[PDB]
Amino acid sequence: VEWTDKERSIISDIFSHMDYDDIGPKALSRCLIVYPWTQRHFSGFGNLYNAEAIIGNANVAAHGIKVLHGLDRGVKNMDNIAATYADLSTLHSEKLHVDPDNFKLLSDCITIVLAAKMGHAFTAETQGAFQKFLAVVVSALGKQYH
């Protein structure tokens, strides 16, 4: 994939200020609420039946940070994300079994969250370059679903 330089500052920037322990729990917890089918795997995490019992699940807290950091490498491996995410994908596919449509649904939960944290700072601009990075990881994230 291609990559402007301004796609690179904004994206680079976006991991400078990004609150990892703030938005991390705020986006997986947000995933399992707007798209509760995503709780399909996390079934052992404890109570998740109703909304704030999900915002009240520490495991999702934890993991949501996991997830967040999991896009770290990609920022490093921008021109090699697929080769870089190849084994993540394969993991989620054969061991985990996660339906790859959900990957794309968490992204929009990650996006959105960042959106209220950056407020007037998450411009069209930044949304463009931000999405145009998660939409590559996800890809790679799916690339080994055979």
Added chain:
Amino acid sequence: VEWTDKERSIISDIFSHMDYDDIGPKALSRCLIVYPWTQRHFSGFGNLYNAEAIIGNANVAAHGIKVLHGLDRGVKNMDNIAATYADLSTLHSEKLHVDPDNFKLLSDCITIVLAAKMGHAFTAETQGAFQKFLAVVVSALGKQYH
């Protein structure tokens, strides 16, 4: 993208037997009809409110031949698709203002009409290669869009 031989052969097979004169017209006819919003750029080809209007219109039949035959080029340029369609992409974008999602709609209808053409020879594996193609090519028609 990267093709296997079976996928090579399969697109060899299918496209060699194509009665462009039937399929061609039809696959545009059924798409006009099952996806009326794609009649945005066919309007002045006559009236189109009715089944008979479309299927029985030559500015679409003879137009559905274009499209199909436009597929020709990709079967021969089997690894240069994106490169190849960038003039088809630029045209449809900056010359006719078409909605790229409409590519897959039409692609889609190219599979239903063909699958009704081929029947059982058209297994899942057969489907697989043909929708891989059109997918490949379709991504190539959505490149010049900015």
Added chain:
Amino acid sequence: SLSDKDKAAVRALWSKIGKSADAIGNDALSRMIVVYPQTKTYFSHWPDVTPGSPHIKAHGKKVMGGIALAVSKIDDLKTGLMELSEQHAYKLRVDPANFKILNHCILVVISTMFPKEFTPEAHVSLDKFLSGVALALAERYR
């Protein structure tokens, strides 16, 4: 939303091919995980999640009849399918985005079976209904 035309249109075709409703599903269920072998995630507990096998084929029936039930209760797929909605939403929590894929392979398989009945006219109607069947399934998801 399905108009009247549609109901007829649909219904009036179910008529024709309802006898092949069994075989149609094992074939649509097969084309689902062939071209889209990532929907195999839910099925992963089936040793033979492969084209037209014991599980895949046997299931084919209890999905096409599922399309039977729908076609009957077309005037109210939400009431008619509500029990399925529990099934796919509170049990095998199936991402709704996958129902489109399935429909897709159900159109293709019916074309390849009834290339004369499945007209464009029965295409838009069947299509609408299929989407219809999807939304109901997604009744109680969230």
Added chain:
Amino acid sequence: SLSDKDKAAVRALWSKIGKSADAIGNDALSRMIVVYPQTKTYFSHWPDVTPGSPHIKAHGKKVMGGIALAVSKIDDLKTGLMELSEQHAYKLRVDPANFKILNHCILVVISTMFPKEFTPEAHVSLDKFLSGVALALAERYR
């Protein structure tokens, strides 16, 4: 279908946020066209396709007023926005998949300006909303 609770949630939210709809509308199209340039196809009539252009803000207003009317008609979304379906489908011939796009957008804009209002709870029941909104609008297409 919007739960009674979804209804109550869409109404709260647009109580706190209907204040600034044109601002929202504007930043929303602005984002659609810049982040989904495959949508400039419908705005081609203009020269003016600048993010935040004047022509692009009146329409923002134009776009949320229909929202505002959607909340007002949240018992029947089909019936209520019938007119708006007529324009998009046959005048404008707007591909319906562009509904899901301005929707993530309005939800992103909605997220920028009102972080305290946009709980996940508010977020979910408003997705359920505009999606039916999107579907209410596909009614006169076919």
